Amino acid sequence: LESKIFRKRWVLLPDYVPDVLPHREAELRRLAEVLAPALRGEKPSNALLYGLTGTGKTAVARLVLRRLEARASSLGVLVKPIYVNARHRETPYRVASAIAEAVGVRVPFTGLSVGEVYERLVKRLSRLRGIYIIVLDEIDFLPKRPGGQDLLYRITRINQELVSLVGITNSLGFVENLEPRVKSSLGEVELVFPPYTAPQLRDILETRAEEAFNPGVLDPDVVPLCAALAAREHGDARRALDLLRVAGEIAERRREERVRREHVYSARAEIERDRVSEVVRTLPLHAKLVLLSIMMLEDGGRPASTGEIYERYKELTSTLGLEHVTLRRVSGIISELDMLGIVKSRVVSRGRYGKTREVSLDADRLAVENALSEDPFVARLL
DNA sequence: TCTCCACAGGAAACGGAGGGGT
DNA sequence: ACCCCTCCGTTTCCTGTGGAGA
Ligand SMILES: Nc1ncnc2c1ncn2[C@@H]1O[C@H](COP(=O)(O)OP(=O)(O)O)[C@@H](O)[C@H]1O
Numbered sequence A: 001l002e003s004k005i006f007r008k009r010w011v012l013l014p015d016y017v018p019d020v021l022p023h024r025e026a027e028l029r030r031l032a033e034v035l036a037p038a039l040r041g042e043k044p045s046n047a048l049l050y051g052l053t054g055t056g057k058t059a060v061a062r063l064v065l066r067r068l069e070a071r072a073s074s075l076g077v078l079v080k081p082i083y084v085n086a087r088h089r090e091t092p093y094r095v096a097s098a099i100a101e102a103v104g105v106r107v108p109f110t111g112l113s114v115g116e117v118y119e120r121l122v123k124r125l126s127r128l129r130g131i132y133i134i135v136l137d138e139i140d141f142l143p144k145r146p147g148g149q150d151l152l153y154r155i156t157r158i159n160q161e162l163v164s165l166v167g168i169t170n171s172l173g174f175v176e177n178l179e180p181r182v183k184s185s186l187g188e189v190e191l192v193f194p195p196y197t198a199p200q201l202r203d204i205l206e207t208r209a210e211e212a213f214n215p216g217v218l219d220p221d222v223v224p225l226c227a228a229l230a231a232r233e234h235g236d237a238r239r240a241l242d243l244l245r246v247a248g249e250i251a252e253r254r255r256e257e258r259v260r261r262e263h264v265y266s267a268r269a270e271i272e273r274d275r276v277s278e279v280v281r282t283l284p285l286h287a288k289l290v291l292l293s294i295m296m297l298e299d300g301g302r303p304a305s306t307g308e309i310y311e312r313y314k315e316l317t318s319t320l321g322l323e324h325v326t327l328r329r330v331s332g333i334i335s336e337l338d339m340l341g342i343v344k345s346r347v348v349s350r351g352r353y354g355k356t357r358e359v360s361l362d363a364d365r366l367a368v369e370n371a372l373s374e375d376p377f378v379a380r381l382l
Numbered sequence B: 001t002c003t004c005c006a007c008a009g010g011a012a013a014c015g016g017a018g019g020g021g022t
Numbered sequence C: 001a002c003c004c005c006t007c008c009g010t011t012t013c014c015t016g017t018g019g020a021g022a
């Protein structure tokens, strides 16, 4: 069941950590020279990687980690690497509950007190015997929320209840919501990923392109274009790769032995409409109803005020015979919607006429629509 | 140059539905 | 049986603030 368009689609998929990473050799080499000593060696100095999305932080770390294991497995010095993703499983609890399991512990999914599961960690941990590297990708989330900052700390202290940390995030805006204490070991080595010039994204895809595609089907300069779109903002290779791979996905639909400029634009189109739909589906009821209220007011231009949004929100709820949340919460919900980038909001004074938000819709409207309609409540409001 | 509107947006905590280990 | 958890949308209380009016 092959194609003529792909030879290895999965290589493009969001998990394949490749084995060469163009333009991030130094970040590769440093992390290598900061963890190798556990190989002869032991306890490696703790380290930290701020940077932006699509800079290839995760790619690197996971690679170094693959290799660090590749050697240890050939040498036969126990050296366990564990990967934990703070964002995809979001809370201070789970982040421990996870990091526990890898060394081999039970997943009570709720039971606990973060400390209870922290304890269990250091026990099966300090009953069996080696040196272990934790990688906490995207820990900024961690401190976002309670015991977040506290757990962080513990884990950096873990090493002397008798172990090493690699913290990853995506915002210098974190050197600061470190308690300098926490700050001061969550990164003994400052590993920082400066982003991607276009001809760099160029070169990356180029590479991933021999791996994944058949060797003529990818048109000339299409990759330059993917770069262009991914560079258009801050450099982000996910999106570059996301793009060029959705591009070929879409060619297979339109049944040709080639990708060119079009399938990319149509790629951009498919991606947002699915991102959008995926959110507005996975949105709380009253969250949905606010979104509608915005939809309903941004009819014309008269961008919706926080204020207005509430009252026809109030209208909607009643029109359905439901209780209604607070303005505070409506307000919160707005800011959320804005982060999900399903809306975009300006903060602006009207003089003595108060202070409020102009909210407008950022995403494809009809996208949002069919989304909303699938929920059997909003649907009623036709 | 002060007033005071219409909120923004942080902190806490809740409630009532998932569950613990003694 | 006891008191303890976590979670997630939400409630309560709150303090801050750009600029049109007088
Ligand atoms: N230098 C690179 N060479 C090849 N592929 C890369 C490079 N940097 C990133 N990628 C790819 O782009 C995607 C996003 O990169 P990643 O490192 O996961 O982002 P983040 O910086 O958020 O960890 C990954 O799927 C990865 O395969």
Ligand SMILES: [Mg+2]
Residues within 6 Å of the ligand: A057, A058, A059, A137
């Ligand atoms: Mg990542």
